[PDB]
Enzyme design. Sequence first.
Site, short mmCIF file in Angstrom:
data_model
loop_
_atom_site.label_atom_id
_atom_site.label_comp_id
_atom_site.label_asym_id
_atom_site.label_seq_id
_atom_site.Cartn_x
_atom_site.Cartn_y
_atom_site.Cartn_z
N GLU A 1 0.43 -1.52 -0.21
CA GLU A 1 0.14 0.09 0.20
C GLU A 1 1.00 1.35 0.06
O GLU A 1 0.84 2.00 -0.41
CB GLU A 1 -0.80 -0.57 1.59
CG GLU A 1 -2.40 -0.87 0.49
CD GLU A 1 -2.71 -0.57 0.27
OE1 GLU A 1 -2.99 0.12 -0.55
OE2 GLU A 1 -4.01 -1.71 0.16
N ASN B 1 -7.44 9.35 -6.16
CA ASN B 1 -7.90 8.08 -6.06
C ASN B 1 -8.94 9.00 -7.30
O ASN B 1 -9.84 10.47 -7.27
CB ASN B 1 -9.30 7.32 -5.46
CG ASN B 1 -8.22 6.82 -4.73
OD1 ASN B 1 -8.93 6.33 -2.99
ND2 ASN B 1 -7.17 6.15 -4.34
N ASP C 1 -12.65 9.37 -8.03
CA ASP C 1 -13.62 9.93 -7.25
C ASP C 1 -13.77 10.77 -6.71
O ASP C 1 -14.62 11.51 -6.03
CB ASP C 1 -14.85 8.91 -6.52
CG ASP C 1 -13.40 8.64 -5.11
OD1 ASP C 1 -12.41 8.51 -5.24
OD2 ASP C 1 -14.44 7.83 -4.48
N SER D 1 -11.47 11.07 -3.43
CA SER D 1 -11.57 10.38 -2.21
C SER D 1 -9.51 10.64 -2.35
O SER D 1 -9.00 10.99 -3.51
CB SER D 1 -12.07 9.84 -2.68
OG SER D 1 -11.65 8.62 -2.88
N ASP E 1 -6.21 8.83 -0.51
CA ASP E 1 -5.73 7.64 0.59
C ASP E 1 -4.65 7.94 1.61
O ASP E 1 -3.70 8.50 1.11
CB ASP E 1 -5.43 6.28 -0.30
CG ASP E 1 -6.49 4.75 -0.55
OD1 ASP E 1 -8.21 6.08 -0.53
OD2 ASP E 1 -6.55 4.87 -1.36
N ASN F 1 -8.75 5.33 3.41
CA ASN F 1 -9.48 6.29 2.68
C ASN F 1 -10.73 7.51 2.94
O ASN F 1 -11.57 6.62 3.66
CB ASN F 1 -9.81 5.53 1.03
CG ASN F 1 -11.33 6.58 0.53
OD1 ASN F 1 -12.07 6.59 0.43
ND2 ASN F 1 -10.09 6.31 -1.28
N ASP G 1 -15.78 -4.82 9.03
CA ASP G 1 -16.60 -3.72 8.82
C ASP G 1 -17.60 -5.20 7.69
O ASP G 1 -18.83 -4.55 7.20
CB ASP G 1 -16.01 -3.17 7.79
CG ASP G 1 -17.21 -1.59 7.52
OD1 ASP G 1 -17.88 -1.42 8.30
OD2 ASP G 1 -17.76 -1.39 6.70
#
EC number: 3.2.1.17
Length: 129
Positions: free
Chosen positions: A35, A46, A48, A50, A52, A59, A101
């Site tokens: 990562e 990203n 969209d 957003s 990280d 995120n 989650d």
Amino acid sequence: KVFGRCELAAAMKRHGLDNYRGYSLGNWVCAAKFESNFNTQATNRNTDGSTDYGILQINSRWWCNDGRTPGSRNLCNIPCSALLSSDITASVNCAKKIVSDGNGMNAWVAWRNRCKGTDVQAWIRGCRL
Ligand SMILES: [Pt+4]
Ligand SMILES: [Pt+4]
């Protein structure tokens, strides 16, 4: 801060990640390697809008507030900048929420593609843990 592999394994172990929700330490070290290359200051934008953040590339759409992700949820209750610290506590605490989650470590695309089903124990080989 750029962690050494065994240094990071030791800090993750200390913060209670070894076998957290069934994922051995090697899984966490492997995910961090791919990562962020063990760099707490890694950021990546990203498509969209957003971003990280940090060692585990958490995120801004769901997990932290960066002030620039319209309709972000801030589930870890933390400014995203806190995830860039040399102290990994905030990243670890947030990762624990993420992996709980429902989708386990599949939430981390590099873990899915590069760690899942590999011999992840190799990532902690030779470390004094
Ligand atoms: Pt430094
Ligand atoms: Pt330490």
